[PDB]
Amino acid sequence: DRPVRVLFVCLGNICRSPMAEGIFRKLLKERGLEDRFEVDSAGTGAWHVGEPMDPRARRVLEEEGAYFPHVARRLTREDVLAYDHILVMDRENLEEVLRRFPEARGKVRLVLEELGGGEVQDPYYGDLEDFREVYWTLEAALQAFLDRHG
């Protein structure tokens, strides 16, 4: 069986989802699982296509050694077909994915389901500390994802 494909999804793909991808990439390295997983992140919207992640996101990832070259892009029908796990940040993201691609019925779910449910709050209107809070919330969810899938 081929490597498991994971796609993190938020609205703009410049804050929460790219941070989730950076953290995941870091964990794959520490656990020696780079040969078993593939990861990327995308947004439901197209407002930021082609842009790098938010400066606050880049800063926090650099602080934790989880930065990577990210380019924001918008989720496509191909993504829904190709990825095995479509992990969204909150319920609005979840409803939006299902609206455009009902075909993702079984594989899309809240990233925090790994910890029994919840939504990762949007830090866009906050400051660096809100971005750090998002980082650790995502870090906890992904360590659990790898314990169960790794």
Distance CA 88, CA 109 (A): 6
**Which of the following is catalytic: 15, 16, 58, 90?**
16
Q: What would the DSSP string read from start to end of 99-113?
A: HH-GGGTTTEEEGGG
Annotated catalytic residue 35: no
Long-range contacts of 136-142 (CB under 8 A, 24+ apart): 137/112, 138/16, 138/19, 138/20, 138/23, 138/111, 139/23, 140/115, 141/111, 141/112, 141/114, 141/115, 142/20, 142/23, 142/24, 142/27, 142/111, 142/114
Annotated catalytic residue 16: yes
Q: Does 79 bind Mg ion (CB under 5 A)?
A: no
Q: How far is the CB of 144 from Mg ion (least distance, A)?
A: 23
Q: How many residues in the shown chain lie near Mg ion by CB under 5 A?
A: 1
Annotated catalytic residue 90: no
**Which of the following is catalytic: 54, 79, 90, 122?**
122
Q: Does 40 bind Mg ion (CB under 5 A)?
A: yes
Q: Which stretch binds Mg ion (CB under 5 A): 38-46, 56-64, 79-87, 94-102?
A: 38-46
Q: How far is the CB of 90 from Mg ion (least distance, A)?
A: 20
DSSP 8-state symbol, 48: T
Distance CA 64, CA 139 (A): 11
Residue with smaller CB distance to Mg ion, 40 or 54: 40
Q: How far is the CB of 43 from Mg ion (least distance, A)?
A: 11
Q: Which stretch binds Mg ion (CB under 5 A): 34-42, 85-93, 108-116, 122-130?
A: 34-42
- Which residues of this protein are in contact with Mg ion, per CB under 5 A? 40
